[PDB]
């Protein structure tokens, strides 16, 4: 994990489920100790051919543990404010907003002290994503 009392920022590519949606996101966080950090994220998803767009902003606690010196397993839990925009040909544009709990599980690999990648599955009550972050130290 990032050094205690330090910040990080990252970006991701995401995918959820015919129907496939792809998009991207950004996140920023503050690490307290090797097991606990907090993060704020923004992600969007768009429907791929053969406007359905969704966006969400979230704030979560991130709890993790080192599987190895370089690999952490982690979970995130918190809330998300979302917006989904639609485009119909009959009814024009539309959108709905909501608030929901949000969860995630993932693995993060510290490539260098400054750079880490992550692989995550996020769900609510899913979206797979790959990302990279920069640790300010
Ligand atoms: C931005 C995409 C990131 C996706 C990479 C995650 C891939 C890593 O492996 C995770 C496990 O593989 C899961 C497979 O996808 C679900 C399969 O079934 C879907 C069709 O019904
Ligand atoms: C939610 C946006 C989608 C995420 C896009 C991925 C972009 C990843 O971040 C790129 C790396 O960060 C930028 C670096 O700072 C230097 C840029 O040049 C300076 C200003 O002109
Ligand atoms: C549900 C998650 C809520 C999000 C948590 C917000 C976390 C709050 O901010 C963390 C960043 O603020 C930094 C702390 O102050 C510095 C502490 O003194 C340093 C040495 O112990
Ligand atoms: C999804 C997996 C992530 C689950 C998060 C784990 C929660 C983090 O805190 C666990 C408690 O921290 C204690 C661990 O360090 C100590 C162990 O014993 C010492 C060496 O043998
Ligand atoms: C507790 C559930 C709510 C989650 C808190 C998130 C609160 C954050 O602010 C939400 C309002 O801000 C609007 C977001 O759109 C802009 C985001 O940043 C742009 C892309 O990088
Ligand atoms: C103590 C280690 C940290 C692990 C705690 C993380 C807690 C994670 O679980 C939260 C509960 O998960 C929510 C699941 O319910 C919704 C599932 O999807 C709807 C059916 O397909």
UniProtKB/Swiss-Prot annotation:
Gene Ontology MF term list: porin activity
Residues flagged as site, Part of salt bridge gating mechanism: 39, 118
GO biological process: monoatomic ion transmembrane transport
A GO CC term attached to the entry: cell outer membrane
TM helices/strands, residue ranges: 6-16, 21-32, 36-44, 55-66, 71-79, 101-110, 115-122, 127-135
Main location: membrane
Key words, A-Z: Cell outer membrane, Conjugation, Disulfide bond, Ion transport, Membrane, Porin, Repeat, Signal, Transmembrane, Transmembrane beta strand, Transport
Entry's localization field: Cell outer membrane
The protein's assembly and partners: Monomer and homodimer.
Family recorded in the similarity comment: Belongs to the outer membrane OOP (TC 1.B.6) superfamily. OmpA family.
Function: With TolR probably plays a role in maintaining the position of the peptidoglycan cell wall in the periplasm. Acts as a porin with low permeability that allows slow penetration of small solutes; an internal gate slows down solute passage.
Description of its domains: The extracellular loops are most variable in sequence, and in some bacteria confer sensitivity to phage and/or colicins.
Name of the protein: Outer membrane protein A
Gene for this chain: ompA
Whole-protein coverage range: 22 to 192 of 346
């Amino acid at each position: 994990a990032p050094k205690d009392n330090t910040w990080y920022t990252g970006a991701k590519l995401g995918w959820s489920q015919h129907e496939n949606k792809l998009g991207a996101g950004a996140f920023g966080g503050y690490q307290v100790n090797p097991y606990v950090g907090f993060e704020m994220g923004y992600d969007w998803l768009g429907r791929m051919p053969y406007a359905y767009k969704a966006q969400g902003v979230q704030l979560t606690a991130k709890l993790g543990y080192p599987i190895t010196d370089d690999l952490d397993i982690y979970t995130r839990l918190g809330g998300m404010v979302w917006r989904a925009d639609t485009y119909s040909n009959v009814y024009g544009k539309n959108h709905d907003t909501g608030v929901s709990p949000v969860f995630a599980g993932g693995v993060e690999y510290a490539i260098t002290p400054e750079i880490a990648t992550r692989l995550e599955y996020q769900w609510t009550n899913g979206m797979l994503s790959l990302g990279v972050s920069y640790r300010f130290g």
